[PDB]
Short mmCIF file of C-alpha atoms and ligand atoms in Angstrom, two decimals:
data_model
loop_
_atom_site.label_atom_id
_atom_site.label_comp_id
_atom_site.label_asym_id
_atom_site.label_seq_id
_atom_site.Cartn_x
_atom_site.Cartn_y
_atom_site.Cartn_z
CA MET A 1 -10.94 -24.80 -24.27
CA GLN A 2 -10.09 -24.76 -27.97
CA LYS A 3 -9.89 -20.91 -28.43
CA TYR A 4 -7.01 -20.92 -25.68
CA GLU A 5 -3.75 -22.40 -25.52
CA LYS A 6 -2.70 -23.15 -21.75
CA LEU A 7 0.96 -21.90 -21.21
CA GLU A 8 1.61 -22.51 -17.57
CA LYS A 9 -0.46 -23.26 -14.21
CA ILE A 10 0.11 -20.10 -11.99
CA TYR A 15 -11.49 -21.58 -5.22
CA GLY A 16 -10.30 -22.95 -8.56
CA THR A 17 -7.12 -23.61 -10.57
CA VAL A 18 -5.44 -20.60 -12.59
CA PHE A 19 -3.59 -20.65 -15.88
CA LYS A 20 -1.56 -18.44 -17.93
CA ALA A 21 -2.96 -18.88 -21.62
CA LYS A 22 -3.03 -17.44 -25.19
CA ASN A 23 -5.97 -16.61 -27.26
CA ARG A 24 -5.52 -18.82 -30.44
CA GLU A 25 -7.25 -15.84 -32.42
CA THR A 26 -5.61 -12.78 -31.46
CA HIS A 27 -2.21 -14.25 -29.53
CA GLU A 28 -3.28 -12.22 -26.55
CA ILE A 29 -1.92 -13.41 -23.11
CA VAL A 30 -4.75 -13.99 -20.68
CA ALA A 31 -5.49 -15.60 -17.12
CA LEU A 32 -7.86 -18.61 -17.00
CA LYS A 33 -9.43 -19.56 -13.91
CA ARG A 34 -11.12 -22.98 -14.28
CA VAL A 35 -14.18 -24.01 -11.93
CA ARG A 36 -15.16 -27.66 -11.92
CA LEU A 37 -18.68 -27.86 -12.02
CA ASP A 38 -19.31 -31.76 -11.16
CA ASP A 39 -16.84 -31.59 -7.75
CA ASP A 40 -16.96 -33.78 -4.97
CA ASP A 41 -16.91 -30.82 -2.52
CA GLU A 42 -20.04 -29.09 -2.93
CA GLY A 43 -19.76 -25.10 -3.08
CA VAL A 44 -17.38 -23.48 -5.11
CA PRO A 45 -19.66 -22.85 -8.23
CA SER A 46 -22.03 -20.73 -5.75
CA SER A 47 -19.09 -18.36 -5.50
CA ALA A 48 -17.50 -18.35 -8.68
CA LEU A 49 -21.28 -16.98 -9.86
CA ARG A 50 -21.26 -14.34 -7.64
CA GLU A 51 -17.63 -13.39 -8.41
CA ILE A 52 -18.99 -13.59 -12.28
CA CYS A 53 -21.78 -11.17 -11.54
CA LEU A 54 -19.92 -8.60 -9.42
CA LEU A 55 -16.96 -8.85 -11.97
CA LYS A 56 -19.50 -7.73 -15.05
CA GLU A 57 -20.42 -4.78 -13.07
CA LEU A 58 -17.04 -3.51 -11.96
CA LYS A 59 -14.87 -2.57 -14.86
CA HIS A 60 -12.07 -0.21 -13.59
CA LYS A 61 -8.26 -0.30 -14.43
CA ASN A 62 -7.61 -1.18 -10.67
CA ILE A 63 -9.98 -3.87 -10.79
CA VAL A 64 -9.17 -7.42 -12.31
CA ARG A 65 -10.56 -7.30 -15.46
CA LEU A 66 -13.01 -10.21 -16.47
CA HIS A 67 -13.07 -10.65 -20.19
CA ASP A 68 -15.40 -13.57 -20.84
CA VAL A 69 -17.05 -16.85 -19.37
CA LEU A 70 -16.83 -20.04 -21.13
CA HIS A 71 -18.76 -23.22 -20.33
CA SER A 72 -17.52 -26.41 -21.82
CA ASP A 73 -17.06 -29.83 -20.58
CA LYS A 74 -18.00 -30.01 -16.79
CA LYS A 75 -16.42 -26.51 -16.16
CA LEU A 76 -16.82 -23.05 -15.91
CA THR A 77 -13.54 -21.03 -17.56
CA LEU A 78 -13.21 -17.30 -16.54
CA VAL A 79 -10.91 -15.39 -18.51
CA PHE A 80 -9.24 -12.21 -17.20
CA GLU A 81 -6.57 -9.93 -18.08
CA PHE A 82 -3.01 -11.55 -17.14
CA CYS A 83 -1.17 -10.10 -14.11
CA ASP A 84 2.54 -11.62 -13.57
CA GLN A 85 2.72 -11.62 -9.66
CA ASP A 86 0.57 -11.11 -6.77
CA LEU A 87 1.60 -8.50 -3.78
CA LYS A 88 3.14 -11.54 -1.80
CA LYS A 89 5.35 -12.59 -4.59
CA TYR A 90 6.44 -8.97 -5.11
CA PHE A 91 7.32 -8.58 -1.71
CA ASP A 92 9.67 -11.76 -2.09
CA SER A 93 11.04 -10.33 -5.26
CA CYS A 94 12.54 -7.16 -3.84
CA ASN A 95 13.46 -8.15 -0.34
CA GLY A 96 10.23 -6.65 0.93
CA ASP A 97 11.71 -3.42 0.31
CA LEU A 98 9.86 -0.73 -1.74
CA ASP A 99 11.02 2.59 -2.77
CA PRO A 100 8.50 5.16 -1.14
CA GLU A 101 7.31 6.17 -4.75
CA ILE A 102 6.14 2.80 -5.36
CA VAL A 103 4.57 2.28 -1.97
CA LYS A 104 2.80 5.53 -2.79
CA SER A 105 1.62 4.28 -6.07
CA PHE A 106 0.51 0.81 -4.81
CA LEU A 107 -1.73 2.54 -2.08
CA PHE A 108 -2.93 4.85 -4.57
CA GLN A 109 -4.00 2.27 -7.13
CA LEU A 110 -5.43 0.22 -4.44
CA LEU A 111 -7.89 3.15 -3.21
CA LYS A 112 -8.88 3.97 -6.47
CA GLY A 113 -10.08 0.29 -7.23
CA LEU A 114 -11.65 0.15 -3.79
CA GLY A 115 -13.09 3.78 -4.42
CA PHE A 116 -14.86 2.38 -7.50
CA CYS A 117 -16.14 -0.80 -5.69
CA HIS A 118 -17.45 1.15 -2.71
CA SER A 119 -19.41 3.90 -4.82
CA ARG A 120 -20.87 0.78 -6.93
CA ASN A 121 -22.07 -0.72 -3.61
CA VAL A 122 -19.85 -3.56 -3.32
CA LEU A 123 -17.97 -4.74 -0.33
CA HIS A 124 -14.54 -6.68 -1.17
CA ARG A 125 -14.24 -8.40 2.52
CA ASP A 126 -10.98 -9.97 1.52
CA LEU A 127 -8.31 -7.35 1.12
CA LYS A 128 -4.97 -9.01 1.68
CA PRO A 129 -1.59 -9.08 -0.54
CA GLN A 130 -2.51 -12.39 -2.28
CA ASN A 131 -5.77 -10.50 -3.55
CA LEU A 132 -3.55 -7.88 -4.89
CA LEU A 133 -2.16 -8.12 -8.63
CA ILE A 134 0.43 -6.40 -10.02
CA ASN A 135 1.43 -5.97 -13.66
CA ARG A 136 4.95 -5.63 -15.07
CA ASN A 137 4.11 -1.89 -16.02
CA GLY A 138 3.55 -1.43 -12.24
CA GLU A 139 -0.41 -1.45 -12.42
CA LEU A 140 -2.12 -2.89 -9.19
CA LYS A 141 -5.58 -4.59 -9.38
CA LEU A 142 -7.71 -5.52 -6.53
CA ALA A 143 -8.74 -9.24 -7.49
CA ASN A 144 -10.50 -12.26 -5.95
CA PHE A 145 -14.25 -11.21 -5.68
CA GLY A 146 -15.16 -14.44 -4.16
CA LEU A 147 -16.02 -12.97 -0.69
CA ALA A 148 -17.52 -9.74 -1.94
CA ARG A 149 -20.90 -8.76 -1.73
CA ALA A 150 -23.61 -6.27 -2.87
CA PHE A 151 -25.03 -3.85 -0.31
CA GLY A 152 -27.73 -1.73 0.43
CA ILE A 153 -30.92 -3.78 0.69
CA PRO A 154 -32.20 -3.97 4.67
CA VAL A 155 -30.89 -6.89 6.39
CA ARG A 156 -30.49 -8.24 9.77
CA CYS A 157 -26.84 -9.04 9.41
CA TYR A 158 -23.82 -10.25 7.17
CA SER A 159 -21.80 -12.96 7.83
CA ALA A 160 -19.68 -12.24 11.05
CA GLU A 161 -16.78 -14.57 9.45
CA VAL A 162 -15.26 -12.54 6.62
CA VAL A 163 -11.53 -11.39 6.19
CA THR A 164 -8.67 -13.31 7.11
CA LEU A 165 -7.92 -12.79 10.91
CA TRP A 166 -4.73 -10.60 10.41
CA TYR A 167 -6.73 -7.85 8.20
CA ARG A 168 -9.92 -8.19 10.08
CA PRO A 169 -11.06 -4.84 11.92
CA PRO A 170 -11.67 -4.73 15.97
CA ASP A 171 -15.48 -4.19 15.30
CA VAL A 172 -15.63 -7.49 13.39
CA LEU A 173 -13.40 -8.87 15.66
CA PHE A 174 -15.63 -8.00 18.49
CA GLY A 175 -18.41 -9.75 16.42
CA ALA A 176 -20.36 -6.83 14.65
CA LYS A 177 -23.01 -8.50 12.49
CA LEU A 178 -23.36 -5.11 10.47
CA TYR A 179 -20.51 -3.26 8.78
CA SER A 180 -20.08 -0.86 5.88
CA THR A 181 -17.35 -0.17 3.68
CA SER A 182 -15.32 0.57 6.45
CA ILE A 183 -14.29 -3.28 6.71
CA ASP A 184 -11.99 -2.73 3.43
CA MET A 185 -10.68 0.36 4.56
CA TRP A 186 -9.22 -1.18 7.83
CA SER A 187 -7.63 -4.12 5.59
CA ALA A 188 -6.53 -1.32 3.34
CA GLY A 189 -4.37 0.24 6.21
CA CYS A 190 -3.15 -2.97 7.27
CA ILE A 191 -1.70 -3.42 3.81
CA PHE A 192 -0.27 0.13 3.72
CA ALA A 193 1.86 -0.78 6.77
CA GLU A 194 3.14 -3.93 4.86
CA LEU A 195 4.32 -1.81 2.02
CA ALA A 196 5.64 1.05 4.06
CA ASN A 197 8.04 -1.41 5.81
CA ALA A 198 9.40 -4.84 4.98
CA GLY A 199 6.37 -6.46 3.79
CA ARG A 200 5.44 -8.41 6.81
CA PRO A 201 1.71 -8.35 8.38
CA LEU A 202 1.62 -5.73 11.17
CA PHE A 203 -1.14 -7.88 13.27
CA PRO A 204 -0.24 -11.31 12.75
CA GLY A 205 -2.48 -12.82 15.76
CA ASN A 206 -2.83 -16.63 16.29
CA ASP A 207 -6.43 -16.11 17.42
CA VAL A 208 -9.15 -13.70 17.82
CA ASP A 209 -8.01 -12.48 21.47
CA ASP A 210 -4.29 -12.07 20.54
CA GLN A 211 -5.44 -10.32 17.22
CA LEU A 212 -7.37 -7.48 19.22
CA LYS A 213 -4.56 -7.34 22.01
CA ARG A 214 -1.89 -6.92 18.72
CA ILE A 215 -4.05 -4.07 17.59
CA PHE A 216 -4.89 -2.47 20.89
CA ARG A 217 -1.11 -2.71 22.06
CA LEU A 218 0.25 -0.51 19.02
CA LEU A 219 -2.74 1.76 18.45
CA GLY A 220 -4.24 2.37 22.05
CA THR A 221 -7.45 0.84 23.51
CA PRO A 222 -10.47 2.74 22.35
CA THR A 223 -12.24 4.61 25.29
CA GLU A 224 -16.20 4.60 25.46
CA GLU A 225 -15.78 8.47 24.18
CA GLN A 226 -13.99 7.29 21.04
CA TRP A 227 -16.30 4.31 20.59
CA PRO A 228 -19.41 4.63 22.59
CA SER A 229 -21.13 1.72 21.15
CA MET A 230 -18.01 -0.75 21.50
CA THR A 231 -19.12 -2.48 24.61
CA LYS A 232 -22.29 -3.29 23.40
CA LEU A 233 -21.09 -5.56 20.61
CA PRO A 234 -22.07 -9.19 20.58
CA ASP A 235 -18.14 -10.63 21.30
CA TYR A 236 -17.18 -7.78 23.32
CA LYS A 237 -14.85 -8.50 26.18
CA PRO A 238 -12.78 -6.15 28.33
CA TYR A 239 -9.35 -5.60 27.13
CA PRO A 240 -6.62 -3.85 29.28
CA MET A 241 -5.94 -0.25 28.54
CA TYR A 242 -2.87 0.15 26.40
CA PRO A 243 -1.65 3.83 25.71
CA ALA A 244 -2.46 5.91 22.60
CA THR A 245 1.01 7.34 22.91
CA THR A 246 3.08 4.78 21.20
CA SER A 247 5.01 6.16 18.29
CA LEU A 248 4.06 4.28 14.65
CA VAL A 249 7.61 5.67 13.51
CA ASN A 250 9.67 2.41 13.39
CA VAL A 251 6.47 0.60 12.48
CA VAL A 252 6.37 2.27 9.10
CA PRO A 253 9.76 3.73 8.23
CA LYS A 254 8.99 4.43 4.46
CA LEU A 255 6.59 7.17 5.54
CA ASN A 256 6.95 10.61 6.86
CA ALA A 257 4.54 12.13 8.94
CA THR A 258 2.05 12.88 6.08
CA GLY A 259 1.75 9.02 5.35
CA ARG A 260 1.47 8.37 9.23
CA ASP A 261 -1.24 10.40 9.29
CA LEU A 262 -2.95 8.93 6.62
CA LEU A 263 -2.17 5.18 8.19
CA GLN A 264 -3.74 6.23 11.40
CA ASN A 265 -6.82 7.66 9.59
CA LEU A 266 -7.49 3.92 7.93
CA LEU A 267 -6.66 2.24 11.28
CA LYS A 268 -9.17 3.57 13.28
CA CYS A 269 -10.65 1.14 15.66
CA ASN A 270 -14.18 2.69 15.69
CA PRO A 271 -15.43 1.93 12.09
CA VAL A 272 -17.53 5.23 11.50
CA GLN A 273 -14.42 7.20 12.10
CA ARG A 274 -12.27 5.19 9.31
CA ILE A 275 -11.69 7.67 6.31
CA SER A 276 -13.27 6.55 3.15
CA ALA A 277 -11.54 5.55 0.18
CA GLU A 278 -12.52 8.74 -1.68
CA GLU A 279 -11.44 11.10 0.96
CA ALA A 280 -8.05 8.97 1.45
CA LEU A 281 -7.38 9.79 -2.08
CA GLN A 282 -7.75 13.53 -1.37
CA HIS A 283 -5.42 13.43 1.45
CA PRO A 284 -2.00 15.28 1.29
CA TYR A 285 0.18 12.12 1.20
CA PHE A 286 -1.29 12.05 -2.70
CA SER A 287 -1.07 15.64 -3.21
CA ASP A 288 1.74 15.85 -5.84
CA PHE A 289 2.13 12.55 -7.23
CA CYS A 290 1.29 11.45 -10.80
CA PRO A 291 -1.53 8.94 -11.94
CA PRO A 292 -4.31 11.60 -11.08
CA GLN B 46 -48.03 -7.34 3.71
CA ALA B 47 -44.34 -7.04 5.06
CA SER B 48 -44.10 -10.73 6.33
CA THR B 49 -42.29 -13.66 4.30
CA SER B 50 -45.23 -15.78 4.37
CA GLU B 51 -47.54 -13.13 2.77
CA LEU B 52 -44.66 -12.37 0.15
CA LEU B 53 -44.10 -15.99 -0.79
CA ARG B 54 -47.87 -16.09 -1.57
CA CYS B 55 -47.65 -12.92 -3.71
CA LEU B 56 -44.77 -14.66 -5.52
CA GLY B 57 -46.63 -17.80 -6.00
CA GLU B 58 -49.83 -16.20 -7.42
CA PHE B 59 -47.43 -14.11 -9.75
CA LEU B 60 -46.10 -17.33 -10.88
CA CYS B 61 -49.58 -18.91 -11.53
CA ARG B 62 -50.61 -15.88 -13.35
CA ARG B 63 -47.50 -15.52 -15.47
CA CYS B 64 -47.05 -19.50 -16.62
CA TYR B 65 -50.79 -19.49 -17.98
CA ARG B 66 -50.04 -22.77 -19.81
CA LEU B 67 -49.58 -24.77 -16.41
CA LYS B 68 -53.39 -25.55 -15.45
CA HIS B 69 -52.61 -27.61 -12.42
CA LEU B 70 -50.01 -25.41 -10.67
CA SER B 71 -51.13 -24.37 -7.28
CA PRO B 72 -49.88 -21.10 -5.96
CA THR B 73 -48.58 -22.99 -2.77
CA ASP B 74 -46.36 -25.20 -5.08
CA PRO B 75 -43.60 -22.55 -5.48
CA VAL B 76 -43.70 -21.93 -1.68
CA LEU B 77 -43.46 -25.52 -0.98
CA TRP B 78 -40.59 -25.84 -3.47
CA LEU B 79 -38.71 -22.68 -1.80
CA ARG B 80 -39.31 -23.66 1.84
CA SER B 81 -38.30 -27.15 1.26
CA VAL B 82 -34.76 -26.00 -0.12
CA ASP B 83 -34.19 -23.46 2.94
CA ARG B 84 -35.22 -26.01 5.36
CA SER B 85 -33.08 -28.57 4.11
CA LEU B 86 -29.90 -26.26 4.03
CA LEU B 87 -30.38 -25.35 7.56
CA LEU B 88 -31.04 -29.00 8.93
CA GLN B 89 -28.03 -30.31 6.79
CA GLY B 90 -25.76 -27.48 8.50
CA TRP B 91 -25.29 -25.28 5.41
CA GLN B 92 -26.49 -22.25 6.96
CA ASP B 93 -27.03 -20.98 10.44
CA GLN B 94 -30.35 -19.06 9.75
CA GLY B 95 -32.97 -19.29 6.82
CA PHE B 96 -32.13 -17.27 3.74
CA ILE B 97 -35.96 -16.72 2.90
CA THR B 98 -36.65 -13.47 4.62
CA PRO B 99 -38.86 -10.23 3.27
CA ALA B 100 -35.58 -8.85 1.28
CA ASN B 101 -34.76 -11.79 -0.27
CA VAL B 102 -38.11 -12.81 -1.65
CA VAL B 103 -38.37 -9.70 -3.40
CA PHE B 104 -34.74 -10.13 -4.70
CA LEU B 105 -36.27 -13.49 -5.98
CA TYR B 106 -39.05 -11.81 -7.34
CA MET B 107 -37.27 -9.62 -9.21
CA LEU B 108 -35.16 -12.36 -10.92
CA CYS B 109 -38.31 -14.09 -11.80
CA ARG B 110 -40.38 -11.25 -13.36
CA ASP B 111 -37.63 -10.93 -15.83
CA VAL B 112 -36.49 -14.75 -16.15
CA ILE B 113 -39.45 -16.81 -16.39
CA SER B 114 -41.24 -16.85 -19.54
CA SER B 115 -45.15 -16.95 -20.03
CA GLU B 116 -44.51 -19.78 -22.13
CA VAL B 117 -42.70 -22.22 -19.55
CA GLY B 118 -44.74 -25.70 -20.70
CA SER B 119 -44.54 -27.57 -17.46
CA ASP B 120 -44.56 -27.45 -13.57
CA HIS B 121 -41.52 -29.53 -13.77
CA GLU B 122 -39.64 -26.69 -16.01
CA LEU B 123 -41.27 -23.80 -13.86
CA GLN B 124 -39.70 -25.64 -10.58
CA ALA B 125 -36.12 -26.17 -12.82
CA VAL B 126 -36.01 -22.30 -13.79
CA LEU B 127 -37.34 -21.01 -10.25
CA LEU B 128 -34.71 -23.29 -8.51
CA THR B 129 -31.89 -21.62 -10.62
CA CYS B 130 -32.97 -18.10 -9.85
CA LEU B 131 -33.24 -19.08 -6.18
CA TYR B 132 -29.80 -20.50 -6.33
CA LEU B 133 -28.36 -17.30 -7.60
CA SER B 134 -30.05 -15.35 -4.97
CA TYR B 135 -28.59 -17.52 -2.23
CA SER B 136 -25.15 -17.03 -4.36
CA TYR B 137 -25.51 -13.56 -4.47
CA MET B 138 -27.24 -12.55 -1.41
CA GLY B 139 -26.75 -15.40 1.14
CA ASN B 140 -24.46 -14.91 4.24
CA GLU B 141 -22.72 -18.42 3.32
CA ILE B 142 -19.85 -18.50 1.23
CA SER B 143 -21.04 -21.17 -0.88
CA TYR B 144 -24.26 -23.52 -1.23
CA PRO B 145 -24.40 -27.09 -2.66
CA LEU B 146 -26.25 -27.74 -5.94
CA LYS B 147 -28.05 -30.69 -5.06
CA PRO B 148 -31.19 -29.25 -3.34
CA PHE B 149 -31.47 -26.57 -6.54
CA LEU B 150 -31.43 -29.55 -8.97
CA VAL B 151 -34.56 -31.27 -10.57
CA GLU B 152 -33.31 -31.66 -14.10
CA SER B 153 -31.34 -34.91 -15.13
CA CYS B 154 -29.30 -32.54 -17.55
CA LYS B 155 -26.70 -30.81 -15.45
CA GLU B 156 -25.31 -28.71 -18.14
CA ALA B 157 -28.77 -26.86 -18.66
CA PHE B 158 -28.80 -25.93 -15.17
CA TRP B 159 -25.38 -24.04 -15.57
CA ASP B 160 -26.05 -22.66 -19.06
CA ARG B 161 -29.54 -21.41 -17.38
CA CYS B 162 -27.24 -19.82 -14.64
CA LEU B 163 -24.64 -18.03 -17.09
CA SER B 164 -27.80 -16.82 -19.06
CA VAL B 165 -29.84 -15.25 -15.88
CA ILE B 166 -26.44 -13.52 -14.76
CA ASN B 167 -25.66 -12.11 -18.24
CA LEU B 168 -29.31 -10.78 -18.43
CA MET B 169 -29.61 -9.70 -14.56
CA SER B 170 -26.72 -8.78 -13.08
CA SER B 171 -26.86 -5.27 -13.51
CA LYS B 172 -30.27 -5.17 -11.75
CA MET B 173 -29.12 -7.52 -9.23
CA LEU B 174 -26.63 -4.71 -8.18
CA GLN B 175 -29.06 -1.87 -8.51
CA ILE B 176 -31.41 -3.47 -6.25
CA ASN B 177 -28.91 -3.10 -3.66
CA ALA B 178 -27.63 0.33 -4.37
CA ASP B 179 -30.95 1.91 -5.37
CA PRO B 180 -33.07 2.19 -2.41
CA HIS B 181 -36.27 3.39 -4.52
CA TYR B 182 -35.86 0.45 -7.01
CA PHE B 183 -36.11 -1.83 -4.12
CA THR B 184 -39.13 -0.15 -3.12
CA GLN B 185 -40.57 -0.28 -6.53
CA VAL B 186 -40.10 -4.02 -6.59
CA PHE B 187 -41.28 -4.71 -3.29
CA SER B 188 -44.33 -2.52 -4.10
CA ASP B 189 -45.01 -4.56 -7.33
CA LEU B 190 -44.63 -7.88 -5.38
CA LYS B 191 -47.31 -6.82 -2.97
CA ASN B 192 -49.59 -5.83 -5.67
CA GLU B 193 -49.15 -9.15 -7.09
CA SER B 194 -51.86 -10.39 -4.72
C1 ALH C 301 -5.23 -16.56 -5.76
C2 ALH C 301 -5.62 -15.64 -7.11
C3 ALH C 301 -4.65 -14.61 -8.01
C4 ALH C 301 -4.10 -15.45 -9.11
C5 ALH C 301 -3.55 -14.64 -10.11
C6 ALH C 301 -2.23 -14.12 -10.71
C7 ALH C 301 -0.99 -14.53 -9.94
C8 ALH C 301 0.09 -14.13 -10.54
C9 ALH C 301 1.20 -14.54 -9.90
C10 ALH C 301 1.37 -15.21 -8.80
O1 ALH C 301 2.46 -15.34 -8.28
C11 ALH C 301 0.26 -15.71 -8.19
C12 ALH C 301 -1.08 -15.25 -8.76
N1 ALH C 301 -2.34 -13.61 -11.75
C13 ALH C 301 -3.48 -13.54 -12.24
N2 ALH C 301 -3.81 -12.90 -13.34
C14 ALH C 301 -5.30 -12.66 -13.47
C15 ALH C 301 -6.37 -13.41 -12.53
N3 ALH C 301 -5.91 -14.20 -11.65
C16 ALH C 301 -4.21 -14.05 -11.51
#
């Protein structure tokens, strides 16, 4: 890509590179256009469309798109690591102020997406990029989509299992910005402990059990339309009385409250990104 | 009307009127080329359900009105641009993560299909999101599509 010099490799292949003209360091994602495995370009094109319309300091920034040889080259701002590597770099042990800082930035980026009518749908630690300056960006919009139009349903099959909410596990075909708030709560739990998935189920049934066992099983009054969902099945009634204290030790009562607001099983009860940003957990803080 | 067949027909009539150079274009040609992609993608197991619904045809018409030049000079070129707009609709609005290129390609020059993808996205990405986010805009477009018949 004449303009860019590939420095190192770090739906496609990602490289750290240098702009030969400004010497700025960028990330280049290459998308092969003559692939053997049909598909890929389709998701890259959706990502380009969304990312052109989502310019925010906490959303990974697309600078440009180059079409040369049998490839699409997406130029992004460079970020050194993803949250997974970050957990590895620091023994999975974040200072509470960094916990708060990362949740804050995550909510700002997510807040921005949702107010623009975009659902991310793939929030997980590897889709979260962290700068050496401490700046977090939501990345990887390959699974994202615009919403608002009248539709009979969306893909029932979105979000890696460990970050998928109960309504989607029960097969809800329509969902809103709530799906990302659930996944944000899961990530908050990783940050606030030792950086391991809160709910690592091996399949759907196991996943729902892990959730209910910690949070309590939702009753009919908290979630009236639950038993009507396409893949609803009776679960045991686990009690709502289990303490969250040892699950998220970096958090005081104020953070535990926010976590339970994000991790509500009934999607309509989940706190929105914007409300979460007005929660007392962020009351003092700084980056506002 | 509110049905897919009706709006497809409004879309087809819109294309014959816009592409005034194409004397032997039938308004059923565009319906036939679109129905054909959809049924193909379904039978070959790329999707569980058809993509062509009333909302998506409106979405497609919104791209077409702004992308398809009145100066298209052959039925083949019209099929290539329409199929480009259709492919972007599937990528943007479809329920599957990815769709294969094959059904959407009718040109021997692959590089031109991709250049056209990038150029439609650079013109349209704002409206593609707006028609989702702004229900009165969706209504305006749906209404113009019907008034095409
Ligand atoms: C799986 C995609 C995330 C890859 C990525 C990284 C990235 C950085 C460090 C990693 O350990 C892994 C991925 N940095 C980026 N900057 C801009 C755009 N994409 C990336």
